[model samples]
Target: VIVPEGTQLDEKQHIVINNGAEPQSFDPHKTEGVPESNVAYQLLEGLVTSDSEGKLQPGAAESWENTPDFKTWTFHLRKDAKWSNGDPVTAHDFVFAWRRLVDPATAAPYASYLSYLQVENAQDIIDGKKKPAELGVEAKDDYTFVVHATNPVPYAVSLTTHQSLLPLPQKVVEKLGDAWVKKENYVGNGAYKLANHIINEKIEFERNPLYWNDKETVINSATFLAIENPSTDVARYRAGDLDMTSYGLPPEQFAKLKKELLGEVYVTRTLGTYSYELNNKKAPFDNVNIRKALNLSLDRNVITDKVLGQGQTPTYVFTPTYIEEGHLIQQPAYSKEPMAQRNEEAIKLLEEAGYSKANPLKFSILYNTNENHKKVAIAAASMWKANTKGLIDVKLENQEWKTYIDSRRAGRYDVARAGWHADYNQATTFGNYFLSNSSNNTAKYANPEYDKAMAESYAATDAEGRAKAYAKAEEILGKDYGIVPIFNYVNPRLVKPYVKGYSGKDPQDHIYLRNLYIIKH
Candidate 1:
């Protein structure tokens, strides 16, 4: 079962996994969804990356250093590192990749993440006010790359570990045009090279001979099956066709799998939150009282405990009580209230919002069409209706995940499904989405006080001030009912016992494929 590094297509050296959903695109700068990274991440590496143990480590860069003020950071690349085409990697390649992401012509959806860099004109480039040439980055020599920060970003190093920030091969891209990712033209420096991609079918990657790590590149090839049906995804795992099912399995099967699969089953807490966004621009939701009533009426416990029976922790605040530098902060005032008391208050708020048994208030709840998403929507609608005593009529609309994203972005619905996962371990990751300028703010919800607090958190010089600044923003979000918080997420993985050395200790535990290997069964 030893996956020899020289072989490209040996099935014995392959690990096939089902990743739940199909990716939207393959190119790094253009991809916005996390699923897309399953393919792109294997073929590229940035200055830094996370290990199988979830620790940050040097990647293409041999080492990097930053000044105390955080205004300047310099990276020293490995001289032996070469592209798949055998050319040496240099600082200029990274600079080109970074600039291409911010270029207005590309219109990358996640280009706004550049704000975290605090680089000069980074915000302006994203705002389309200035060109990408104005970005604050430099290549003083072949191996040295420097970045200038406009403000203190405590989480800047961690942000670079994100997949969207990884470097790309400019030479292949220019020669192949938009078709550079095709099997014939694909070139990369990571452990894998692209072999094939059949939309919603499968993506196959072969080992990259040019990868610098000779000893640790264990897997020679891999395939990710885009199986949207949860039952089929799990069935493959049972039939020994798939070595792993990563995103999750159906809730009903989790109990049996955990009991039977023992060592193969792994479930752990994630630094993420699932919530609903009420478009402040829409009808009755435009009223603050209505938003609050809906927020309190839906019992988060029932949704997390009954409908989704994993390790999901329920909460009523935007920032979970579980996150931030290993400590708990303030909780929502209403969370301590009895369930009956909260529901009764929600009923009274409904009355205040001009709803009654005679004249019921009604609205549609929109969610993505997945087995799990459908269950959550049904539970939410049932809870809301039960609380209002027939004073509300709820409709559930389901769309595919991609369609749902586009619809919500276009402001096509009143109440929409949403979730936020941390870009870094900081509370800023959860709170920043509500900033008026964030692309991920699907609900079209905005507030001056909330935006001001988030900005203040970024500029704060001390840790306590920064925590308090985020707490203040979360308070505004909860009080205004800008978003209804349900529970934090839990990732469930089912891997074959023969697979060795895979790890995901935290929410940021994005996979490190090079560490996985198959042992003799």
Candidate 2:
């Protein structure tokens, strides 16, 4: 709300939202987390925005087209679009931003995004073997942005909706250096402009009057602060101090709030999976028997049932019910066996792998330091140690979110806690990570036959062929013990009745503040 400091906030023109933990960084090129994407999507508008059902709507691009071969796509930007700094944003903005995004020097974590669409020469460029200028996007005219794909991409429009393809302000970055995200240097083309920022305090966004679509914009301001502790967030929501929380309500409050605020509670299936990345390149884990033993020793059911206590389904697969839920025709066979039988087989495998009660298998679970993740590590560790007859001693190493990513990249982690949220509503997004060249594959898994499957899937011209290819690639990953899928996720969130035009049910789980208005009670 537009309540000045020291003024009582009775009724206001703005709404405050909590995006859970503070984002590590807001630079769209460097961001990988959903929380970061949440903030970036507000500041940097995508070419096309998707609705609750994932139907595409116009955003920066007023219209677009594709060649008959489906390998080339062209987008026409609105002439009125301009960055907050009054710099005229054009097709070159997208071209330059995308080239830098996949450029080897920029080191964008989401570079795999371009690879997914098979952008011409993107993979080679990311591998540093080619020039960034060779990557295939060009400005045909002042407002015309065109892209060349390596293969026919049916989901290209949905792909552009991702934050990775969002246009960037080269002037700001080059002028401000690494400090470009600060309030003074920040220049965004979205409906909101960066008004102020205080680390761990509050990030304030004011409505940008220069925006092309400002006439339809209702919300005048948005303030987001990190409420790391979900419990405190719930208390604020209950006390009517918070209009909404970007992070869902804490799992502990679901029952009480569901009964109290029936219509306000939001719960739905999300297109993401919670899983562990077992570093296949590391010792002990380097052995398949060791991997199999570890995989079989513990139960996935308990993690979801007791530890999470949320409406998550135990999973033996990474791909969730996205794009085509029923396309999954198979699952890991051991996932069907009883826990007792699975534990027995697991013990035998450990013995065969030269680990015994006297010579115990020792390793660590390198998990990010989150209260919820720590609980899972504690629960799962105790269960594995107990079930394996004390042959396993798993040390728990907790790292912060940013540091953990570095550790995983360095292969310093033995078993790391990891998860994947879909970039697009397809199983290929889940399958692509394990490719040998994929920057997202934290496990360092590399099976040439498996990589072949992934390549074939991307090259497939027909949708059925693509789906079948991904399904086959998923099976290959499961058989290799590359990743142990724990459970599929469902988001349980809350929004006050006064918040209008906001729904926490998008497939990508995004809420654009531009479409919202705070109704006075």
Candidate 3:
């Protein structure tokens, strides 16, 4: 095996190796976590794309038009698009994929991608009250598709850019039966194809020769190595064995790195939101007042400054305001108060709910075992203990990411750290995650009022009306429900000086090889 040399790789035709812990699955439909989605996106293409400014641009569909009533949308597919298996990509694939996502039997975690779908009885179909085909989507021809939305969604095109909205070959999905996502059976219709995936070892991808825009793809091949050790991974980067890495350095280490390798260190504020999800279905947390108390007790500013370092900012809103225009179209209600002030109020709420220094509220906060996570959890635990008059015992538990996710889905933990990075630059991408009926709603949180508002919001024809409706729904979740919002995440990518032609913002801050071109000497 060839070892990497320094921060830069040799200027030659060779594979670029980077590191990630591991991914749960490569299946785009079922991949719930960031790692899986990051890799899967390279192998798939959505109907739309998010421009650098986070606005929607056409992708697989060259152009699209919607009817005046906003109930019907016509999409013109690219004739040149083809799947990795040499199958012609058509409108039928998208229809099939959309149907599969909302199919009651499939129970996709991302079924909310069809929220505004105007099909005849899409809501009823999602509610298992009707058949999948009863919902709105029609292929006028192989390259022409029409979609009906129950309401007018201003970001309809932006919604299609998400992975949950990407197309899948109906024939290939059926041919593989239940093992469609298995390494051997998997096929893609994106810029790259899965060349190799050795479990717990490595995942490799090569450019798709059949890609419609293959000429624009730069890198020859890309490899993601599973490195469990952060120190070892950093060492590899310093040794010039890896082109980029996200394992952040501690303040002390960062200070030393700045002195020695100033230009090598890079940092940026991200749109990602990190928080602890309290399972309302479980005990202690089952008490709404208790959940509220917990949310109010922690000082988020301290967490951001002490745990995340000074670079990151504390966030109350679920949707980041930087994207798609300079202002936030919608804002959550609970975020109206500062996180620091909420802590003092939280203590009073807990006291009113029957808790004091002698008999404190006890609970555990679960997070994945990583150096940063451990530090963050410990600091949070300290803040809760200090502010809650010693009436709260915040136990910290660490587990591997996959195992932790399984436990969360099973509702095995009272409180757990959860973060969402955008799959695409859309507010709906974040807002849809916590909906009562969303497949990704692991909290088991159900609010009919919120659901009604979201459904109605999707149907609204006016942009301001839709945003207001969405804001109402978000307020119910963030303010009334107490989901516990933490600081927004900003990942700093340390890129080697040699890599060139890598442009555009990463929707999920994922590193895609196709976007990188080598600097010819």
Candidate 4:
């Protein structure tokens, strides 16, 4: 039998967690993956933070206000907010970070996100048509920051919580250059500060004594163990070496863990989608018929119910269904078609695309190294081969998380596994990534219609108009087969019962150690 939760609580007022893959970088502007975000969310506090229920709350900025047209905004910073090094967290820090985020030299993956916010000159700055210093943000005073949007940004407040929008300590960053994110050189304004970092091993954080709200922060320190293997994470949890397991629990072992761990297991719905991105610039994928064939032939029902038996739902659209007024989005007709008919349609499409057993369609499915991802890839490959009667030759390629991310970002793969979590709780959080100018659009997909619809969604003043615009954008993606939607994510986890203040209501799935505490047995 498993030991009771309190029996294993750390006596030193510390906790250790399995935070998935080793991070490549911790710089808020440069990092894009969830693995890095898990650590960054602890080390930095954004202008706004989401509450347990995913509602926007005051963070570094005590409060914010927007104009009637939602084109201009002002944020009032807290005078008491202090960086880990005892420096005041000011509006100028945010101005510096926002400018750096839009700088072309930074090459920030989420640069388009700010542009999507319609921040004045953000796009031009990113395109080098204007200088970063000319971005439409100003520190009116030490504690007052203002923003001017080129278009109405209905989601501007929510967007402030994104990692790329988080403020930076300008002095440390400019002085150290690329070395600023190093543990020894890190300066942050959150409840925790980097205490130690060992590449691919563990990252340690200690309570930030200078944090404005440190008086309420319990759990003096925390360690995030970099273990990519799901099985290894489970093993460590049972061995009492970890206080929490990351969002991913081994799919196959879900039943066993639920029955064995009892209340320790948590299955929370998240605003995220898991999909495979096909590089539109590549050979076979460059053909629309081939892209449609591949999407139709892959059986999402089998993948979700049989292979990944976790509570994940098969998705027909890229964005999760939980976005506000998401029901207005239209689903592709093929989602209602029978599997047999879908397979036949796929065969016909593939035939028209000039692929047959005589000249098999050959391509590799690239995924990050992880047992669960491997299982999903294997299942997908098998489905394509079996459904296509040998006309599809699928090769599977696995890489470490960092390498896999780089490969996808560089558009070097035919098909690569991709996942997107909400940067903000809106359809545009996922929709805008496909824009022609989006730096995060790794698939290299582009359509003028989709771009127009997204722009409309950004500028719409009425809720219905906003929802309709997103619906049109998603319909375009369906017709173009920009990306194959696999399933919506469910964040399954293992948290020791004594880990107080843990809440799963946040669709973003952010965990702030500052609000948690350890209980004695």
Instruction: Specify the highest-lDDT model's number.
Output: 4
Clashes per model (N, Cα, C within 3 A)? 1, 1, 10, 0
- Candidate 3 or 2, higher lDDT: 2
Question: How much lDDT does each candidate structure score?
Answer: 0.78, 0.79, 0.71, 0.87
Give lDDT tens digits, candidate 1, residues 1-521. Answer: 22555534324767998866777667877666657777777888888877766678889888998898877888999989999889888898888778878887877767777776677897898888998888898788989989888888767787787666787787777677668766777777888887888876888888888888845687787889877666677889999999988666788988998899989887767787788888888888888998888877888889888988888888787776666732335667888888788889889998888889888887887886667777888888888889878777789998765677678877898888777777777777777778877766776778898899878865778778888888788788888888788888887788888887666475664665687877764
Estimate the TM-score of every prediction. 0.93, 0.93, 0.88, 0.96
Clashes of 2: 1
- List the pairs of residues colliding in candidate 1: 118-150
Sorted by TM-score, highest first, which candidate order results? Answer: 4, 2, 1, 3
Tens-digit lDDT track of model 4 for 1-521: 11234455456789898888888799988889888887888889988886556778788988899999999999999987888888889999999999999999998988887798889999999999999999999999999999999888867899998888889999889999879988779999988988888888998989988887778677899999988878888899999999898888787789988898889988778889999899998987988998899889999989899997888999988977668756687768998899899899999998888789888799999998888888999999999988988889889999988899889988889999888998888788888889988988999999999998887876567888888898888999889999899999988889998786677778888888776778776
lDDT string for model 2 (1-521, tens) is 22224533235568888876667787888877777788888888868886545567888899999997788999999987888878888888888889888887777888878988889999999988889889898999988999999888777887888888888887777677658877777788888887887887788888888887888777788888677666777788888878786544566667888899978877667778888788898887888888888788779889888777768788887777455522753678999999899999988988887777788888888876566777788887898889899888788999766777778878998888887888877676777778888877778899998888778865677777878777777788878888778887777767888776656666667777776776655
lDDT of 3: 0.71
> Where is model 1 poorest over a 10-residue stretch in terms of lDDT?
1-10
Worst 10 residues of 3 by lDDT: 1-10
Q: List the residue pairs that clash in candidate 2.
A: 1-14
Best by TM-score: 4
Weakest lDDT window of 10 consecutive positions for candidate 2: 1-10
